Design a protein around this ligand. Structure first.
Ligand SMILES: O=C(Cc1ccccc1)Nc1nnc(CCSCCc2nnc(NC(=O)Cc3ccccc3)s2)s1
Ligand SMILES: O=C(Cc1ccccc1)Nc1nnc(CCSCCc2nnc(NC(=O)Cc3ccccc3)s2)s1
Lengths: 408, 401, 411, 404
């Protein structure tokens, strides 16, 4: 079927110029740097070094180049990806980005100076589909800390390694009342859910028990690396030192969890707090965070490597929790109006999943009074407005809505 | 070339003629029923010609009016292509929940207390109108709280989200009112009472009830919908909590201006006392599953906004204090009622009704709860299951008060 | 040597005979009124002998004897300085100053949820005092009638405990203040109303009184009780207020239906009938003067100080004071208990019924209410009273700083 | 017109020309005063001098002359409880009746509490005139624990004033698990959160050791220099296991509930030290009696606390003294009271007396079972209740009148 692909792209010409193949490939939304295309691109480079002709691939030479990644290339070229007309869709992404750009309100988080420093005018959006198709607009290569955006990810790691039953013996599954917002613990002495601070503190104590903080951290970072397809994941020591210095509320919670015996036997509470502040201080960009979201969108498989990272159980539970508990006190309105699993963070990040379709990261630093990014909230509403993405939006009958699949 | 000739050749199986019984049998195994409103012209034509064996020309005369729907059915286009295998799975889950004898039948009124604990039905209607039933599926029972998503859908269809949500909130919560002096959501009693006062304002109760009943008829594709006066009289008599709620709503000025609150409570009780069966309630669920189109008639009944909102609310607040646990484990919008009904939606796939009177300590039906758990264990149907990658799970969209 | 004789000498001051007006003015300066029911023999005899006298208006030692003998004990306590406040004139002078200072406080808002409340003038302000010995004083608008409203709640609770006992009553109703985080809940965890001083507890207390008879008879029974507490001074009924109250009582109907749902009433209760009776009890009218005597009865352990009659059991009074202490001034109850330290009840007419146990009762009336629903003038007055005099619960009798002590000479 | 000392001598002499020392001493004890009373030191020093046998009008006068006012008060029956002997016999009955109340669990969160015997039971009384009585185990040291809370609040109000103190802490009962009220202030000095903030208030800008010395000296005055001490083993255990109090302290710190320059960790140390202060029933009754007496120590005469401090302290003890039981206790018992996890209840009867009751086993609410039973029995017997009428009471007895 390397043969068939040749005929498709050639346009009845004898030979295909390299740049024409590359251009057609990029228009699918794949990137030439995609890890699943490595053999093909290695072969194009090499044959460019060794070639008799200029840039022209004849049937035989194209076959040489694509054969190892032929299945993925034919999917791309046939239009079998989740969003077949990716170019049209990315143009829509850009307009929504421009519209949200206008929304100038909100306040940058200043409780530590690493958050305070960020310009209010930083605004980026990245997309990664479940087939690995990519796009980005605005400030999508600027590093920033996940903060509470790491909470679903470490809950995923916990459930993956340990199972639903073990995890939920320590942490609940439900949104607390709009009037149990300030309660550390529910009636069973369990924190309400893994997306509040007390719940995430307990989740942090479940991961990789019985090794030191360095190894625990290495384990989580290696896991984050796979979810992001080995795109950027780093660490802000400066952020960490600040979080630790001013984490009075989290120390309060940790002492209370200790008193109510909420930790697994043998836990060093102060050491778990330290780990917690480190996980908060992990750095991403919009582009790498979008792939992490897309992994969640894809049932636990990283769409740009094809690697199994998370179990189906881990992903399902994480999405359910992000649905109901992921946007602080705006979670109910968010679920009603947007209808997508989403997690916000105090850096202005919103990690957004569109199950079966794609993953997003939206970043801008000024926050609204709920602590959610202003541009990001406006973007997510506008995205649902446009597209049939909502949770309960009918796949066959959708009104004036467009359907891109169809054609701390 | 002909569409009808193509279908004739596939059913004939290269033989000279198709007997009528063979066509009917083949049609039934797709899940459609011969009383399907969309197949009426075909079935009328069959009646006429029968007044046993059909040839190309005669089959074509019978099927031509309904040829598109029939071709979808026979070319395995439906949402569940292998429906017989799926109904075999449904039957297994039914038998398993049947053995789950726990729970208590509600007895706050005599009409509820009368029902046997042994009654147990499950009905399915897909978004293509494919139908299955097991157990006690033609036994009328009161909707009770199951009517709450239906009347909220009506209110949002008629008035819009913005107007409705001036009076009632949109999030899961003892208290009658949130911080803003609105009831928390249309799914609780307080929100349902306020929703009831939004519908068809400025006409008497008798006209309001007629309007709602006509709307319900369309939702159920004209299958069974009725009303228990006896339940209504009992509900009114014994509804002290609802009167308490109503007088608090009035005090806090929660109703639209010109509201007679004691009249609204009567209408609310009547709406609670509406009767369905499993079969007809499954069609109303399928209407919700199908974007507001009724899958058996093809009629548009509810706006997309109304259905989306109703599903959102059924998700978070549909099964009393088990709503949180239910969302996490089952992952499907669902409403339960004190008669033991669970009205279950699987968006883009199907509508279900499960009925069994004994309730658990949360108010939800024992067998129905056990059923919905097992359904999701077996099938990829959870909201946050993945369509391309899922566990040991079966995907029936694919060929194997 | 005779009790009547010795009294004669002390008032006489060595003169052979006492002019009547001299006896009267001396009697009044103790703080008693000539209209006092326990003085009735004496005053009837003075009037009679005025008609029959050869020497009118002057009083012979044997004529004084004839006049005073029946009421000699009480008059000797008055004239000896054996009353709870011996220098009553100096005290009333202080009451006057505190009254004037409160008068100048002119913020607040007249209630207006019903037209009967609405219409009252914001500048009405009256204070009356009745000591535990029947000594009386009044300043400002103290003969103007107004509804008790929630000021009737400790009174109706007192009647319930009097007739039925603590044990029976508190099966139906709690003993504790709600808290701000159940400020809006009708029932506690045990499904009881939190205390008799909130509307839901008051409704339930209303259902306990004189069970088995019709509303007219229940009403009459409570009115006679009220008449006794007030020493037969003015106690009336506003039908206009009652009709208004039942018309706009959404809140209380909500509560009544919830109480019915949770089985909070005694077996056989007609809850809509109970609500009618409750609205009637809210609509009872007092003046400052008569309500002060009601508060004085509570100050005096259930005896009415101006008639000497036993009205309430010691248990009933003690319970009522304990509840008034902790739960009597809506959401200001905690702040009031800390700063004033006196059992007190407020009402939406701008009434504050105030007890100083073992000393006096008071009624403070002014209609404008602050945010908590308490009378602005009354609140200002209660704080000022406590600043001046050592009448806070936890003020000390032997040691107290720059406070004065009256007991010493010196809806 | 004969001397005050001569008048007193003839009344004790009962016609006889001379008085035996022992006869004077017996008579004096019968008024409830103790021969060790600090106000009687001069008299007892004089008796010690002359005795190294009968006294006569002159030696007697020489002995009692400088304490004659207090002695005359005692002998003429001018003390707040004139028939003290009869009253102490009622106290003994009440004691014996509560002795039979075997139930309750001794606290065991800390080893030092779990050591105590369930059968220890003492009650001490100190009247506002210094009259004393004790039954049971009343000279055994135990920790104040939360009984300390009204005392250190009293100290803070005395030194700093009502308005300063209550910028930091509220004045009201909450049934709540919340650390702070709607205003971000802890609810009242009587809860842990409030007591930790009141701890921060006292003697600011000196080291912990100096702060503790100051509180100890203040406790000494309150107890009229009777027993006060410190359990270091309780302090160490208290600190090692106080996770809830660290949780509170970190939350008070986030919410900026302390005065600027507070070292929160250091405050918690101080707070644990205050909890670990030891008293006896006897000495604790005196501290209660100071509270009952308006801030004056009844056995010394010293002005310990200001009237504002005492009044505020009593008000708070009334509403929030007895943990969850508070509202119930106020309704039935009607007395300012505090209680502690060691089984202590400090009880005040304003203008009459202070008590301390101690018995280690606790009911479900945290209060001592014998203690609670004794407080109910006192109030049903006598008419100590705060809304009990002084003229009119029905078959109650009025000893004021001669018959963590
Ligand atoms: O947040 C305000 C008022 C405010 C402040 C600022 C602005 C406005 C208003 N006040 C606060 N005070 N402290 C706070 C920290 C969390 S409460 C600390 C202790 C607990 N944490 N989780 C608990 N769970 C249970 O007790 C379980 C349970 C629930 C129900 C039944 C049984 C068992 S208790 S927030
Ligand atoms: O539910 C138990 C305890 C229990 C019972 C049984 C067993 C255990 C425990 N007791 C109950 N007592 N009464 C009940 C009826 C509903 S409360 C009545 C009036 C209100 N309805 N909604 C309101 N909303 C707000 O006032 C909004 C708001 C919230 C926060 C701030 C401002 C405004 S106030 S339930």
């Amino acid at each position: 079927l390397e043969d068939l692909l040749f005929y498709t792209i050639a346009e009845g010409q004898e030979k295909i110029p390299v740049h024409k193949f590359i251009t057609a490939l990029k228009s699918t939304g794949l990137r030439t740097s995609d890890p699943r295309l490595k053999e093909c691109m290695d072969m194009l480079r090499l044959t460019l070094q060794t070639t008799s002709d200029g840039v022209m691939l004849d049937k035989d030479l194209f076959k040489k180049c694509v054969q190892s990644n032929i299945v993925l290339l034919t999917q791309a070229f046939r239009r079998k990806f989740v969003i077949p007309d990716f170019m049209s869709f990315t143009s829509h992404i850009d307009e929504l980005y421009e519209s949200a750009k206008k929304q100038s309100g909100g306040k940058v988080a200043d409780y530590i100076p690493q958050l305070a420093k960020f310009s209010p005018d930083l605004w980026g959006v990245s997309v990664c589909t479940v087939d690995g198709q990519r796009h980005s607009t605005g400030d999508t290569k600027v590093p920033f800390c996940l903060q509470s955006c790491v909470k679903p990810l470490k809950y995923a790691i916990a459930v993956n390694d340990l199972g639903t039953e073990y995890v939920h013996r320590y942490v609940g599954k439900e949104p607390s009342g709009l009037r149990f917002n300030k309660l550390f613990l529910n009636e069973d002495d369990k924190p309400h859910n893994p997306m509040v601070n007390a719940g995430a503190i307990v989740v942090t104590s479940l991961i990789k028990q019985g090794v030191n903080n360095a190894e625990k951290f290495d384990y989580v970072m290696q896991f984050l690396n796979k979810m992001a397809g080995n795109e950027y994941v780093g660490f802000s020591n400066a952020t960490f030192q600040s979080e630790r210095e001013s984490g009075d509320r989290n120390f309060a919670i940790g002492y209370y969890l200790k008193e109510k015996k909420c930790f697994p036997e043998g836990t060093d509470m102060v050491g778990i707090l330290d780990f917690y502040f480190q996980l908060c201080s992990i750095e991403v960009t919009c582009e790498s965070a979008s792939v992490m979201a897309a992994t969640l969108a894809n049932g636990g498989f990283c769409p740009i490597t094809g690697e199994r990272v998370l179990s189906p159980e881990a992903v399902r539970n994480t999405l359910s929790l992000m649905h109901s508990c992921g946007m602080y006190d705006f979670s109910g309105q968010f679920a009603f109006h947007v209808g997508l699993p989403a997690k916000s963070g105090v850096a202005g990040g919103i990690l957004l999943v569109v199950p079966n379709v794609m993953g997003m990261m939206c970043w801008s630093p000024p926050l609204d009074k709920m602590g959610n990014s202003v541009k990001g909230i406006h973007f997510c509403h506008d995205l649902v407005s446009l597209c049939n993405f909502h949770n309960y939006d009918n796949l066959r009958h959708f009104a004036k809505k467009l359907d891109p699949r169809r054609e701390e």
